């Protein structure tokens with residue numbers, strides 16, 4: 001009778017059709033993310049086409065019920081989420097152009113290849129040309145790989161990325177956003193919920209304020225890492241200059257993880273890497289994920305579904321073909337949860353398994369919510385839940401009790417500093433990188449960076465914010481942003497920044513529930529059901545409540561705070577402060593490896 | 597002194613859709629319910645009236661075996677005083693119900709790759725069902741104010757829909773076969789006894 005009742009009825013119809021259509025699309029995408037055949041690309045595209053057309057139709061349908069005449073809030077939220085056309089608001093020509101641009105960019109990224117000037121040995125980002133960036137200490141190899149990637153694959157993406165920005169800006173402006181960057185920031189928006197609202201530019205302000213508070217720790221990590229790397233690269237690194245980009249541990253410097261080998265503080269005590277002990281106890285991927293399941297169960301969380309073990313792909317296809325390895329956690333719908341990860345018998349994939357299974361735990365928690373409310377609060381809540389699992393699972397203790405760290409081993413000052421330094425190389429290093437990359441994107445979409453300075457401003461921002469300098473001068477012909485995965489396939493990147501901020505609020509509140517004593521960084525939430533109970537009270541919500549609240553359901557607050565991150569890393573803060581009492585904390589943006 | 601045809605009820609090759617749930621009347625026979633209980637091949641065997649151990653020592657004038665197929669999650673709705681889609685629009689047990697609800701997982705028959713859609717359920721209805729009511733109408737449900745003219749459209753949706761039963765679904769979305777046994781007790785003599 002009333003408009004809200006017709007809205008309920010329409011939403012019910014939509015739910016019951018969308019379950020089947022979503023499962024079709026997710027199953028075709030799984031069959032291609034596991035078989036990778038032309039046929040599978042075709043089936044994947046056709047399922048997604050049916051799915052996207054059903055959404056355009058249903059969004060047009062949902063706009064026919066005015067939000068003005070609705071009072072039940074969950075219904076209002078499902079209708080708001082359903083009333084959005086996205087790329088559909090563009091003309092058919094512009095939408096097909098944008099889709100072809102996205103396709104060509106993704107294939108340029110996935111098939112890009114460069115040849116060792118030595119011989120040919122073409123090497124694509126996969127294994128080799130990545131293996132180089134993660135394992136080589138030879139300055140020339142790193143530089144060749146870095147520059148050849150950004151020249152042979154980035155230069156192809158430049159005009160495509162320009163047209164991409166143009167079209168997707170048109171799309172955002174048609175959806176009444178001011179630019180595509182604001183369209184991305186619209187994930188954190190909260191409207192019509194007093195004391196819990198949140199605007200799209202408040203994210204700008206809060207991110208910049210939290211990064212102002214992050215800067216000192218990063219400056220001293222930067223000074224110490226520059227010291228160690230200058231020890232290992234004398235003629236290549238100025239003691240006051242910025243870090244050369246090609247010497248940072250991966251193809252971009254996204255994570256400083258791989259630098260631990262050359263930067264570990266106390267190199268004569270048990271280094272924390274079970275990579276061997278797992279090999280000595282004959283661990284396989286089955287054992288790794290079984291141990292992750294045991295972790296979650298120890299906290300009050302359910303075991304994995306039997307469909308998880310049966311349908312998941314946990315190991316590179318022994319004799320199958322292709323298969324994408326990017327570790328992803330799949331919530332196909334209809335109670336079907338899977339994990340795709342080419343798991344190796346290492347410590348790194350052992351932590352990635354806990355991360356992805358935490359993703360799955362979230363998916364299972366809010367599986368009782370309506371289909372439209374089945375998602376982490378914001379884009380970050382999912383990733384932060386994933387990361388707190390790795391935070392706990394990497395703790396010396398957790399590894400001790402797991403029989404992966406010699407029980408006869410003292411958590412002394414120096415091993416704790418070593419663990420902190422590894423954890424900071426991974427977590428803290430990615431924060432200025434992430435903030436700076438998303439800031440560059442935001443400005444390019446807002447129109448504040450002209451095309452003829454696109455890259456000039458890219459590197460300036462690397463020197464200023466990140467303390468990293470390009471080793472070779474790049475003309476606007478280049479497109480080094482698009483050389484990173486997330487940029488070239490249209491993915492927001494600030495989710496990793498906000499993940500890292502939330503994950504320490506969560507992990508603090510959960511470690512208070514678990515009665516943990518000592519510095520927050522040594523915390524282990526295993527065997528504590530009160531912690532998992534607290535976490536489920538937020539997880540089971542999905543996004544049926546603005547994130548502000550869910551966050552209250554764990555940490556008690558509704559604000560993005562770096563103070564827990566800084567409490568975690570406070571011991572390494574003071575130690576870095578002492579190992580730089582006579583060094584230069586900071587960097588000058590003038591010194592380059594090519595100016596002499 | 598013949599045996600009750602429970603075999604053609606439980607061991608039936610195809611079950612009914614819940615909106616058109618299938619009823620069989622059971623009379624002039626002897627039933628050994630204890631074999632149904634001790635089969636232990638059921639995920640749910642909940643009696644809301646008599647104790648399942650005992651009915652082998654009881655007599656009734658008539659027994660009604662209703663059968664259909666739903667999702668596992670929905671099996672909790674086959675009970676007295678339940679709400680939701682199945683108990684409101686498809687199969688409503690009364691509050692004073694005096695039978696047993698049996699239900700088992702039919703993944704290996706009622707699901708298949710590509711989708712078993714044979715099974716339906718009613719999603720909309722102008723009012724809730726009365727106890728043991730059965731509505732099999734396919735008239736277009738009118739959600740808005742404009743009449744539907746027997747064709748789907750704006751605020752006009754076809755009342756019945758399909759369960760998509762895939763072998764990789766979760767147990768909550770897997771097909772469960774349901775048989776509800778109702779025991780009625782009138783002054784009429786008893787044609788159905790245990791032993």
Ligand SMILES: *[C@@H]1O[C@H](CO)[C@@H](O)[C@H](O)[C@H]1NC(C)=O
Pocket residue numbers: 602603604606607
């Ligand atoms: C169904 O078949 C089983 C054999 O698997 C048999 O024991 C049983 O008597 C039959 N009938 C019923 C009602 O279970």
